[PDB]
RNA sequence: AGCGA
């Protein structure tokens, strides 16, 4: 997902003016990790009785 | 094809808070990720690291 | 053009320190790359010396440049298209150009506008960004302490 | 001229018919501006800013920012999977 | 989503 956004703006953004700071988006990556760890039937609640 | 982007060197920092503190204050026990990005422009020729 | 240790200017990232003339070869051609680092973005850029002037590596901000953008900032007899859509796009392109004279024109025109009327959130952000880049540019052109650069800029705006 | 007229009409109808609850145009615009500012600050800074941060950025009050967040809320669906919340 | 009969 990050890559699709990056390549999308990689054309629209003007050249000689941009940088990976302005190119990369970490929102979807962090969202993917969070949506895995929470609300996934493998990220099970610790069963410690 | 006139420009490209690359990644390297995944690297962590120390965790931002210890286990018991994270468990108490409902924080998620995590640590940051740092990745060396590198933009290159083919036609003119640079690296933006 | 620039040896080691030069505080060489480079757009859009202001002044920067050359660290070494790298001999990093490509396709068997030992290009004389120079590694060049800024303090704000904490990023290192390697550029071939052949096309350094083509990428537009700036130099010590010419002393004339100060009074030039001061004249632009004091430049009277300035008017804009009646439709602010056209005005906005035009001066947005002027800021995008990055030329110190054009940006000075932008900031002084918008200073006149916002002392007269009180304009908009988008315009307030426009003036803020242009003013920030310019107070930085003048503060390292004269090497005079960004806060004090701001004071002198406010002094010249009133004229 | 066709382009501008078209865009005006589309945006107006979208706003009027966006959510099950109706949110007039000027408040829609400030909501969109708040969202754009927050998104660009997330891109630049990397952290979600604070209500006082957005209040100072938008030249408004933190209580106003809180109200815009409140009215920005979109209804949840009684229908879901868990089963339906309606249970 | 997980669990007992």
UniProtKB/Swiss-Prot annotation, chain B:
Q: Which domain of life, per UniProt?
A: Bacteria
Coiled-coil residues = none
Relate the protein's function as given in its record. DNA-dependent RNA polymerase catalyzes the transcription of DNA into RNA using the four ribonucleoside triphosphates as substrates.
* Assigned protein family: Belongs to the RNA polymerase beta chain family.
Q: How does it assemble?
A: The RNAP catalytic core consists of 2 alpha, 1 beta, 1 beta' and 1 omega subunit. When a sigma factor is associated with the core the holoenzyme is formed, which can initiate transcription.
Protein's name according to its UniProt entry = DNA-directed RNA polymerase subunit beta
Q: Which organism is it from?
A: Mycobacterium tuberculosis (strain ATCC 25177 / H37Ra)
Underlying gene: rpoB
UniProtKB/Swiss-Prot annotation, chain C:
Q: Report the SMART domains cross-referenced here.
A: CarD_TRCF
Q: Enumerate the UniProt keywords alphabetically.
A: Virulence
Matches recorded under Pfam families: CarD_C, CarD_TRCF_RID
The record ties this protein, via InterPro entries, to: CarD-like/TRCF_RID (IPR003711), CarD-like/TRCF_RID_sf (IPR036101), CarD-like_C (IPR042215), CarD-like_regulator (IPR052531), CarD_C (IPR048792)
One GO BP: rRNA transcription
- Give the record's family classification: Belongs to the CarD family.
Q: What does this protein do?
A: Controls rRNA transcription by binding to the RNA polymerase (RNAP). Required for replication and persistence during infection of mice.
This chain's protein is named: RNA polymerase-binding transcription factor CarD
The lineage, from the top, is: Bacteria, Bacillati, Actinomycetota, Actinomycetes, Mycobacteriales
Q: Which gene encodes it?
A: carD
From Swiss-Prot, chain D:
Q: List the disulfide bonds.
A: none
Specify where the region named Sigma-70 factor domain-3 lies, as residue ranges. Answer: 29-87
Location of this chain's protein in the cell:
Cytoplasm
Q: Which domain of life is it from?
A: Bacteria
Family named by the database record: Belongs to the sigma-70 factor family. RpoD/SigA subfamily.
Purpose:
Sigma factors are initiation factors that promote the attachment of RNA polymerase to specific initiation sites and are then released. This sigma factor is the primary sigma factor during exponential growth.
Assembly, per entry: Interacts transiently with the RNA polymerase catalytic core.
User: Know the name of this protein?
Assistant: RNA polymerase sigma factor SigA
Q: Give the species.
A: Mycobacterium bovis (strain ATCC BAA-935 / AF2122/97)
What is the primary gene name for this protein?
sigA
Full-protein residues shown here are 346 to 437 of 528
């Amino acid at each position: 997902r990050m890559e699709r956004v990056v390549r999308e703006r990689m054309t629209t953004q003007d050249v000689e003016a941009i940088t990976p700071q302005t190119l990369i988006n970490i929102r979807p990556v962090v969202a993917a990790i969070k949506e895995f760890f929470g609300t996934s039937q493998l990220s099970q609640f610790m069963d410690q009785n | 094809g006139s420009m490209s982007l690359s990644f390297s060197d995944p690297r962590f920092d120390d965790v931002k808070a210890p286990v018991d503190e994270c468990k108490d204050k409902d924080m998620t026990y995590a640590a940051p990720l740092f990745v060396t990005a590198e933009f290159i422009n083919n036609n003119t020729g640079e690296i933006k690291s | 053009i620039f040896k080691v240790g030069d505080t060489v200017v480079y757009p859009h990232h202001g002044a920067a320190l050359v660290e070494a003339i790298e001999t990093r070869t490509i396709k068997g051609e030992q290009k004389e790359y120079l590694v060049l680092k800024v303090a704000q973005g904490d990023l290192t850029v390697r550029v071939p010396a052949e096309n350094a002037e083509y990428v537009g590596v700036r130099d010590v901000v010419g002393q004339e440049g100060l009074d030039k953008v001061f004249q632009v900032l004091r430049a009277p007899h300035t008017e804009e298209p009646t439709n602010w859509s056209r005005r906005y796009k035009a001066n947005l392109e002027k800021l995008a150009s990055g030329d110190v004279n054009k940006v000075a024109e932008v900031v002084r025109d918008l200073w006149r506008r916002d002392q007269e009327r009180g304009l908009s959130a988008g315009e307030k952000r426009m003036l803020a960004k242009a003013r920030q880049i310019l107070v930085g540019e003048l503060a390292l052109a004269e090497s005079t302490d960004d806060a004090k650069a701001e004071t002198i800029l406010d002094e010249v705006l009133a004229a | 001229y066709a382009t501008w007229w078209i865009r005006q009409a589309i945006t107006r109808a979208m706003a009027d018919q966006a959510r099950t609850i109706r949110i007039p145009v000027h408040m829609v615009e400030v909501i969109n501006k708040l969202g754009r500012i927050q998104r660009e600050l997330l891109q630049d800074l990397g952290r979600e800013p604070t209500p006082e941060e957005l209040a100072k950025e938008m030249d408004i009050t933190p209580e106003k920012v809180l109200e815009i967040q409140q009215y920005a809320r979109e209804p949840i669906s009684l229908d879901q999977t868990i089963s339906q919340l309606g249970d």
